[PDB]
PDB file of C-alpha atoms in Angstrom:
ATOM      1  CA  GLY A   1      -5.121 -56.581  65.713  1.00 43.64           C
ATOM      2  CA  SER A   2      -8.076 -58.760  66.633  1.00 43.03           C
ATOM      3  CA  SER A   3      -7.845 -60.679  63.378  1.00 42.00           C
ATOM      4  CA  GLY A   4      -5.116 -63.302  63.398  1.00 44.11           C
ATOM      5  CA  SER A   5      -2.360 -63.495  60.811  1.00 42.53           C
ATOM      6  CA  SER A   6      -2.388 -64.652  57.208  1.00 43.37           C
ATOM      7  CA  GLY A   7      -1.437 -68.208  56.330  1.00 45.85           C
ATOM      8  CA  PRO A   8       1.681 -68.625  54.181  1.00 44.61           C
ATOM      9  CA  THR A   9       2.639 -71.693  52.182  1.00 43.57           C
ATOM     10  CA  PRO A  10       5.774 -73.853  52.012  1.00 43.45           C
ATOM     11  CA  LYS A  11       6.510 -72.746  48.467  1.00 42.77           C
ATOM     12  CA  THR A  12       7.847 -69.555  46.934  1.00 43.63           C
ATOM     13  CA  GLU A  13       8.831 -68.223  43.530  1.00 44.84           C
ATOM     14  CA  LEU A  14      12.244 -67.531  42.045  1.00 41.78           C
ATOM     15  CA  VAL A  15      13.383 -63.936  42.370  1.00 43.49           C
ATOM     16  CA  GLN A  16      16.428 -62.295  40.833  1.00 41.81           C
ATOM     17  CA  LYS A  17      17.867 -59.323  42.681  1.00 39.95           C
ATOM     18  CA  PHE A  18      20.652 -57.297  41.111  1.00 38.28           C
ATOM     19  CA  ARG A  19      22.395 -54.477  42.939  1.00 38.55           C
ATOM     20  CA  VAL A  20      22.225 -51.709  40.363  1.00 39.29           C
ATOM     21  CA  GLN A  21      22.404 -47.934  40.572  1.00 40.06           C
ATOM     22  CA  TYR A  22      19.469 -45.650  39.867  1.00 41.75           C
ATOM     23  CA  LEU A  23      20.333 -42.998  37.309  1.00 44.33           C
ATOM     24  CA  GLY A  24      16.803 -41.631  37.268  1.00 42.82           C
ATOM     25  CA  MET A  25      13.537 -41.655  35.354  1.00 44.13           C
ATOM     26  CA  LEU A  26      13.555 -40.074  31.915  1.00 42.73           C
ATOM     27  CA  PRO A  27      10.361 -39.916  29.842  1.00 45.89           C
ATOM     28  CA  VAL A  28      10.295 -40.917  26.194  1.00 44.76           C
ATOM     29  CA  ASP A  29       7.879 -40.521  23.307  1.00 44.87           C
ATOM     30  CA  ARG A  30       8.777 -43.705  21.468  1.00 44.14           C
ATOM     31  CA  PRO A  31       7.800 -46.715  23.589  1.00 44.64           C
ATOM     32  CA  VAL A  32      10.010 -48.769  21.304  1.00 42.32           C
ATOM     33  CA  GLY A  33      13.456 -48.202  19.841  1.00 41.25           C
ATOM     34  CA  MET A  34      17.115 -48.123  20.806  1.00 44.20           C
ATOM     35  CA  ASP A  35      18.219 -44.701  19.625  1.00 45.44           C
ATOM     36  CA  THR A  36      15.829 -43.044  22.048  1.00 44.16           C
ATOM     37  CA  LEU A  37      16.778 -45.603  24.670  1.00 44.65           C
ATOM     38  CA  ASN A  38      20.469 -44.793  24.464  1.00 44.19           C
ATOM     39  CA  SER A  39      19.686 -41.107  24.104  1.00 44.56           C
ATOM     40  CA  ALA A  40      17.747 -41.338  27.347  1.00 45.50           C
ATOM     41  CA  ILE A  41      20.570 -43.099  29.152  1.00 44.83           C
ATOM     42  CA  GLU A  42      23.320 -40.892  27.778  1.00 41.18           C
ATOM     43  CA  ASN A  43      21.116 -38.019  28.879  1.00 37.85           C
ATOM     44  CA  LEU A  44      20.759 -39.305  32.421  1.00 36.71           C
ATOM     45  CA  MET A  45      24.325 -40.572  32.413  1.00 37.83           C
ATOM     46  CA  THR A  46      25.647 -37.034  32.170  1.00 37.55           C
ATOM     47  CA  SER A  47      23.126 -36.048  34.817  1.00 36.22           C
ATOM     48  CA  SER A  48      24.224 -36.907  38.335  1.00 35.78           C
ATOM     49  CA  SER A  49      27.572 -38.602  38.834  1.00 34.69           C
ATOM     50  CA  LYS A  50      27.946 -42.359  39.104  1.00 36.07           C
ATOM     51  CA  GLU A  51      28.479 -42.368  42.851  1.00 37.45           C
ATOM     52  CA  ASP A  52      25.490 -40.054  43.048  1.00 38.66           C
ATOM     53  CA  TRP A  53      23.330 -42.876  41.748  1.00 39.88           C
ATOM     54  CA  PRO A  54      21.899 -44.759  44.735  1.00 40.15           C
ATOM     55  CA  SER A  55      22.764 -48.440  44.920  1.00 39.58           C
ATOM     56  CA  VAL A  56      19.412 -50.136  44.460  1.00 39.52           C
ATOM     57  CA  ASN A  57      18.373 -53.694  43.697  1.00 40.15           C
ATOM     58  CA  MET A  58      16.367 -54.920  40.730  1.00 38.06           C
ATOM     59  CA  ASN A  59      13.842 -57.539  41.776  1.00 37.21           C
ATOM     60  CA  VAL A  60      12.636 -59.883  39.060  1.00 35.58           C
ATOM     61  CA  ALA A  61       9.792 -62.305  39.673  1.00 37.67           C
ATOM     62  CA  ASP A  62       6.244 -63.144  38.657  1.00 36.87           C
ATOM     63  CA  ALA A  63       7.280 -61.586  35.367  1.00 36.29           C
ATOM     64  CA  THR A  64       7.790 -58.227  37.033  1.00 34.96           C
ATOM     65  CA  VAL A  65      10.551 -55.704  37.621  1.00 42.46           C
ATOM     66  CA  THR A  66      10.575 -54.078  41.039  1.00 43.42           C
ATOM     67  CA  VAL A  67      13.440 -51.827  42.064  1.00 43.69           C
ATOM     68  CA  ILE A  68      14.085 -52.479  45.736  1.00 43.70           C
ATOM     69  CA  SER A  69      16.372 -50.329  47.851  1.00 48.57           C
ATOM     70  CA  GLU A  70      19.689 -51.580  49.176  1.00 50.52           C
ATOM     71  CA  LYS A  71      19.104 -50.941  52.860  1.00 50.49           C
ATOM     72  CA  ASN A  72      15.654 -52.488  52.717  1.00 46.68           C
ATOM     73  CA  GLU A  73      14.498 -55.711  51.104  1.00 47.64           C
ATOM     74  CA  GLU A  74      10.928 -54.563  51.620  1.00 48.37           C
ATOM     75  CA  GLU A  75      11.044 -51.016  50.307  1.00 49.54           C
ATOM     76  CA  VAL A  76       9.956 -50.738  46.692  1.00 51.15           C
ATOM     77  CA  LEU A  77      11.482 -47.720  44.992  1.00 52.28           C
ATOM     78  CA  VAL A  78      10.045 -48.465  41.571  1.00 52.20           C
ATOM     79  CA  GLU A  79       7.546 -51.132  40.585  1.00 51.53           C
ATOM     80  CA  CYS A  80       7.600 -52.091  36.924  1.00 54.96           C
ATOM     81  CA  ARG A  81       5.911 -55.071  35.313  1.00 51.81           C
ATOM     82  CA  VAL A  82       6.789 -56.951  32.148  1.00 53.80           C
ATOM     83  CA  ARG A  83       3.084 -56.712  31.413  1.00 54.06           C
ATOM     84  CA  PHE A  84       3.288 -52.935  31.553  1.00 53.50           C
ATOM     85  CA  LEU A  85       6.635 -52.790  29.793  1.00 53.49           C
ATOM     86  CA  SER A  86       6.993 -51.599  26.217  1.00 58.51           C
ATOM     87  CA  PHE A  87      10.665 -51.958  25.375  1.00 57.89           C
ATOM     88  CA  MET A  88      14.221 -51.783  26.658  1.00 59.93           C
ATOM     89  CA  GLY A  89      17.818 -52.747  25.978  1.00 59.78           C
ATOM     90  CA  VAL A  90      21.398 -52.067  27.000  1.00 59.05           C
ATOM     91  CA  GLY A  91      22.578 -48.526  26.374  1.00 57.36           C
ATOM     92  CA  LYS A  92      25.891 -47.635  24.774  1.00 58.02           C
ATOM     93  CA  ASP A  93      27.838 -49.133  27.653  1.00 60.08           C
ATOM     94  CA  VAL A  94      27.055 -52.683  28.703  1.00 59.46           C
ATOM     95  CA  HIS A  95      27.025 -51.313  32.230  1.00 59.00           C
ATOM     96  CA  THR A  96      23.660 -49.670  31.680  1.00 58.47           C
ATOM     97  CA  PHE A  97      20.086 -50.898  31.494  1.00 59.28           C
ATOM     98  CA  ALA A  98      16.937 -48.968  30.661  1.00 59.89           C
ATOM     99  CA  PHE A  99      13.400 -49.968  29.757  1.00 59.05           C
ATOM    100  CA  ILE A 100      10.318 -48.079  28.636  1.00 59.36           C
ATOM    101  CA  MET A 101       7.299 -48.735  30.822  1.00 60.18           C
ATOM    102  CA  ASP A 102       3.631 -47.869  30.463  1.00 60.97           C
ATOM    103  CA  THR A 103       1.979 -45.931  33.262  1.00 56.21           C
ATOM    104  CA  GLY A 104      -1.025 -44.601  31.382  1.00 58.35           C
ATOM    105  CA  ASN A 105      -2.256 -41.513  29.573  1.00 60.83           C
ATOM    106  CA  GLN A 106       0.023 -42.029  26.595  1.00 59.37           C
ATOM    107  CA  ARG A 107       2.925 -41.703  29.004  1.00 61.55           C
ATOM    108  CA  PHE A 108       6.092 -43.770  29.150  1.00 59.85           C
ATOM    109  CA  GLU A 109       8.939 -43.772  31.643  1.00 57.46           C
ATOM    110  CA  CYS A 110      12.432 -45.096  31.036  1.00 58.13           C
ATOM    111  CA  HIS A 111      14.203 -46.217  34.188  1.00 58.30           C
ATOM    112  CA  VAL A 112      17.946 -46.089  33.645  1.00 60.08           C
ATOM    113  CA  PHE A 113      20.199 -48.301  35.732  1.00 60.10           C
ATOM    114  CA  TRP A 114      23.800 -49.432  36.019  1.00 58.85           C
ATOM    115  CA  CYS A 115      24.469 -53.156  36.088  1.00 53.24           C
ATOM    116  CA  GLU A 116      27.852 -54.817  36.440  1.00 50.10           C
ATOM    117  CA  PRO A 117      29.800 -56.098  34.965  1.00 51.51           C
ATOM    118  CA  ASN A 118      27.145 -55.778  32.287  1.00 51.39           C
ATOM    119  CA  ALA A 119      23.371 -55.569  32.083  1.00 56.88           C
ATOM    120  CA  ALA A 120      23.333 -58.852  30.201  1.00 60.14           C
ATOM    121  CA  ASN A 121      21.842 -61.066  32.885  1.00 58.83           C
ATOM    122  CA  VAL A 122      19.613 -58.276  34.141  1.00 58.14           C
ATOM    123  CA  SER A 123      18.298 -57.398  30.703  1.00 57.44           C
ATOM    124  CA  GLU A 124      17.862 -61.105  30.080  1.00 60.97           C
ATOM    125  CA  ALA A 125      16.324 -61.918  33.441  1.00 60.54           C
ATOM    126  CA  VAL A 126      13.952 -59.080  32.639  1.00 59.31           C
ATOM    127  CA  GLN A 127      13.569 -59.967  28.978  1.00 62.03           C
ATOM    128  CA  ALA A 128      12.961 -63.641  29.654  1.00 62.56           C
ATOM    129  CA  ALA A 129       9.912 -62.261  31.422  1.00 62.70           C
ATOM    130  CA  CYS A 130       8.900 -59.694  28.832  1.00 59.97           C
ATOM    131  CA  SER A 131       9.574 -62.032  25.933  1.00 59.75           C
ATOM    132  CA  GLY A 132       7.876 -60.200  23.090  1.00 59.39           C
ATOM    133  CA  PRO A 133       7.606 -60.539  19.304  1.00 57.75           C
ATOM    134  CA  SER A 134       9.891 -58.848  16.806  1.00 58.36           C
ATOM    135  CA  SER A 135       7.214 -58.066  14.247  1.00 60.58           C
ATOM    136  CA  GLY A 136       9.854 -58.120  11.535  1.00 61.66           C
TER     137      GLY A 136
END
């Protein structure tokens, strides 16, 4: 390592980590909507028990959503960005959070998660970042 080391700065950003479980990744056709959202969750929900879901952490910063493991603050299970997001919301139960992301090739992935006591702060912390129009 001939080259020295990078030079950090005495200033960081605000990050919000939330220990949530990882239900799994279910694809969806509609990048927007709740029905499908819930449907996705409910689908995953049934799949794999609750305890089966690995306790992960949801990092939120720089308007991004990165799912970091529990036994590793460096590991990045899933890396989602509010800029690549399409939609989301809280499933049937308030203890569930899923959002449709954009990967490319007309493909969308919905990452289901379990937040307690409710995915209100998470969804918000994530939404506050997304912050999109309603086009009503």
